[PDB]
Amino acid sequence: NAVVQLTELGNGVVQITMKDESSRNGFSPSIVEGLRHCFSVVAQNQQYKVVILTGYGNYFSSGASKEYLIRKTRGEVEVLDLSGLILDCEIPIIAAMQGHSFGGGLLLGLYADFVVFSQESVYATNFMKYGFTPVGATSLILREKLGSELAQEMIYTGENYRGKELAERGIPFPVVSRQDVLNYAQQLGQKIAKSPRLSLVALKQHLSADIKAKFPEAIKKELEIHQVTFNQPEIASRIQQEF
Amino acid sequence: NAVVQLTELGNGVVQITMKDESSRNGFSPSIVEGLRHCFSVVAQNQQYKVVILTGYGNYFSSGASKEYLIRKTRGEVEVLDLSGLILDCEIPIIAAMQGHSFGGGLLLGLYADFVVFSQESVYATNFMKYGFTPVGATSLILREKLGSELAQEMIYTGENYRGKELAERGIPFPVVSRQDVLNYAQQLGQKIAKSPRLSLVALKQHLSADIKAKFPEAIKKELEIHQVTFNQPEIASRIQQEF
Amino acid sequence: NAVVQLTELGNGVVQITMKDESSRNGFSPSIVEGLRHCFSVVAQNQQYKVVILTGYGNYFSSGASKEYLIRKTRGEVEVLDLSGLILDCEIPIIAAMQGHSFGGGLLLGLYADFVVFSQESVYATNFMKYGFTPVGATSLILREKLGSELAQEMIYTGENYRGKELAERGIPFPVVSRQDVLNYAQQLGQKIAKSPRLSLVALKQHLSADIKAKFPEAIKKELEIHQVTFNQPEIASRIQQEF
Secondary structure, eight states: OOSEEEEEEETTEEEEEEOOGGGTSBSOHHHHHHHHHHHHHHHHOTTOOEEEEEOBTTEEEOBSOHHHHHHHHTTOOOOOOOHHHHHTOOSOEEEEEOSEEETHHHHHHHTSSEEEEESSSEEEOOHHHHTSOOOSSHHHHHHHHHOHHHHHHHHHHOOOEEHHHHHHTTOSSOEEOHHHHHHHHHHHHHHHTTSOHHHHHHHHHHHHHHHHHHHHHHHHHHHHHHHHHHSSTTHHHHHHHHO | OOSEEEEEEETTEEEEEEOOGGGTSBSOHHHHHHHHHHHHHHHHOTTOOEEEEEOBTTEEEOBSOHHHHHHHHTTOOOOOOOHHHHHTOOSOEEEEEOSEEETHHHHHHHTSSEEEEESSSEEEOOHHHHTSOOOSSHHHHHHHHHOHHHHHHHHHHOOOEEHHHHHHTTOSSOEEOHHHHHHHHHHHHHHHTTSOHHHHHHHHHHHHHHHHHHHHHHHHHHHHHHHHHHSSTTHHHHHHHHO | OOSEEEEEEETTEEEEEEOOGGGTSBSOHHHHHHHHHHHHHHHHOTTOOEEEEEOBTTEEEOBSOHHHHHHHHTTOOOOOOOHHHHHTOOSOEEEEEOSEEETHHHHHHHTSSEEEEESSSEEEOOHHHHTSOOOSSHHHHHHHHHOHHHHHHHHHHOOOEEHHHHHHTTOSSOEEOHHHHHHHHHHHHHHHTTSOHHHHHHHHHHHHHHHHHHHHHHHHHHHHHHHHHHSSTTHHHHHHHHO
């Protein structure tokens, strides 16, 4: 079966589940194509009103693979950007992050309208751990959703934070036990799905307008800086040591 | 006596109390005219430095009446907007929300410079409960004052939140026992009233400038979307069932 | 010895310590010249990656002296502005506020990229206590870093808040025991210093861009209002009574 599956939960709530065990829900060709396909099925089905995006087991999304980053050091690829994919969805998305989220994987979840974290799992914007600056409008999104101070610490350090540590820090999102994350997202989705679809779509467009306006320039600015900081002598070795 | 009364608390602190029991401090002609009158008396009395706006009993403001909304479905009225009224006041306002606040009633309080919530009372931006989008620059104000995440949940769900639940959620305002709300507002007003009036007025103008700049466009945008989402087939029936 | 001293902590982390006991780390000529000198030494040493700015004993910075304010009432001076000095530093700064911070002294710390507060010490933007409006882009910075609601209360009241009270209020920064403040800042500095300097500088420039864009107009606007509110009949007497 496909590594990304769409299921119906009732009342217009649907669940898109990522299960690429081989990459631990990394940004693999299978995951990218599966997400694109599942979101296209959603766009086509006018009865759907809320999407819950979730992972499998211990992983929500581990983002770009270390093998991919190494390939990048030899200038062999370009930078993947899934923002368009998620941001194009016209109905509300809840990211039920029941497992770990790293790098673009944390951003993937934070692109959503609502986010649920697991107490026991680990979250990081770890670009700076490898020694280079973020991509994907990380600072725009993280500052908007997490608050400027938490965003800044996470981005500068690149460190791994448990959900429980983030909660203690005053993150504005629910942080619950791993076994409760998806259930929490589902209950919230059902509350939201009580509204007419037309109203949900209109409201989401209204609420997203300010960030969407700022997004293309943010992505561009971060890419330009990333190209400079990634292409420095010591980066290849730093990436080697994170294996 | 008038349903809206102004009393002096000393040192330039005044209290405007809404007590329209018949409408439960809804946006009745009596409440609108009483607020306009009390704020005009305030504008004229240069010795006043801080206004505390409060309700009576279990209600701060229940906003627009369900009978009014039904009338609206038959296109019989226009949309009331009290923002100009509150935002024109040149001295600081503290909304002592000792009781429930719904819809425009919660916005009325959130237009103020400082807000105090009751632990036991219920608060909602419930437009989406009836199935249509907000008016009154709800998303501008709620996102600015409550933070984007709480604002988003409240707006999308339209649900009733107890003050205690909001406090647990990390709302940036004081949430205290119902019997302590007005006393808390009064003590804060007295602290603020220690400054010269000229300084209070100058500071308030400075601090309010950014939001006031964004307000006319926000009100307009929300009205346009509200007109579309309100005038859909199923709305009349949804309103009927909220009685 | 000089009242402002730079020491190396290892791995590119340096500490700038203010110790003007005579003024309690006020904005004295010695402190201003010492800060300028220590930041110039930092700018010149490309091996440095993080600055920790701290005070001595019970004081981080007491800001402008009351004797200076009195001199100002007779129109005898101009307004000191250390923002340029701190904001010009191209590497990340952590303000380890182990002691009290007042007025410009609190702003001095809040200009930094990261801030650590002491539980037992007192913090105030106390301009309004003397009866006039702030300078130094206080409302821009405080609203951005502390959140709009806490910022507003602090600015309007001008009152002294213990670190513990701020923590209870949900300030987005660490608040720890006085004896732990500098150690906490040092550990954070060491985490940040793991990144290449080029990346730290590029990231800081990116993250600071939005506020830096708004800063010159904010400083100007606040100065203009301050000139009006400071030069009112009763201010001299209010300043006299704060001695």
